[PDB]
């Protein structure tokens, strides 16, 4: 007589979660931002995903982009509305090195242009793993000699996001922050794993500092 609908894997994971945010200012040629895509830089979504060993899902991407006026000396700063470009560069593709780089032509790379004041941009991504499922944990190495990189980072080859101001700089600098939100959809999960107990320490491995199993009480009969 009580349904378990809200404890489904879908309902548990199909909620948008911030995975990273980056900043960039319009006052330099290096005024762009980059982020190597990964789900291990935030505690909450990482812990939710790491309840399982293997996952297979589609992804909904939503960006929240906000700007702030930086100090300036010009009288009467009056800036038009700002337009932003976010470009996805799959591994092996050319990467931008400056705001006015030729790589922003995005002839084949998927890119999104969005103007401030509108609804947040949003796009969908399919399951893009070379394997049959995403891996949350990998007890192995990248090299056949068992030297070098050990762990889950060997399987992270998902590419890089690049972000920049489209508008040319005006009479005052503008600093913008882009917040990236991941929402898994059509999720399939396998091999449940104990929830993470020790606090996370690093992005690329499972390193931890030992912590007690629970909080304590005075005696075995204390209520």
């Amino acid at each position: 007589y009580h349904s378990r609908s809200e404890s489904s894997i879908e309902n548990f994971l199909c909620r948008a979660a911030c995975v990273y945010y980056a900043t960039y200012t319009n006052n330099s040629e290096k005024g762009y931002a980059e982020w190597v895509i990964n789900t291990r830089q935030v505690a909450q979504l990482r812990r939710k995903l790491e309840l399982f060993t293997y996952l297979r899902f589609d992804l909904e991407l939503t960006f929240v982009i906000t700007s702030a006026q930086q100090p300036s000396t010009a009288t009467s700063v009056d800036a038009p509305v700002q337009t932003h470009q976010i470009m996805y560069v799959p591994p092996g593709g050319p990467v931008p090195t400056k705001v006015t780089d030729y790589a922003w032509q995005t002839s084949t790379n998927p890119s999104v242009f969005w103007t401030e004041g509108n609804a947040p941009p949003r796009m969908s991504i399919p399951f893009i793993s070379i394997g049959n499922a995403y891996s949350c944990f990998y007890d192995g190495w990248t090299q056949f000699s068992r030297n070098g990189v050990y762990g889950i980072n060997t399987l992270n080859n998902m590419g890089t996001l690049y972000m920049r101001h489209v508008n040319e700089a005006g009479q005052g600098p503008i600093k913008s922050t882009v917040r990236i939100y991941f929402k898994p959809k059509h999720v399939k999960a396998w091999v449940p794993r104990p929830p993470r107990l020790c606090q996370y320490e690093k992005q690329k491995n499972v390193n931890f500092t030992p912590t007690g199993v629970t909080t304590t009480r005075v005696g075995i009969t204390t209520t």
């Binding site: 879908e10 309902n11 199909c14 589609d58 992804l59 969908s124 991504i125 399919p126 399951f127 959809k185 059509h186």
Partner: peptide, 17 residues
């Protein structure tokens, strides 16, 4: 509407509920 897919890709569909 009630349920109509607007896109040609399955990844575009809403969640499985």
């Amino acid at each position: 509407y009630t349920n109509i897919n607007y896109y040609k890709d399955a990844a575009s569909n809403s969640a499985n509920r």
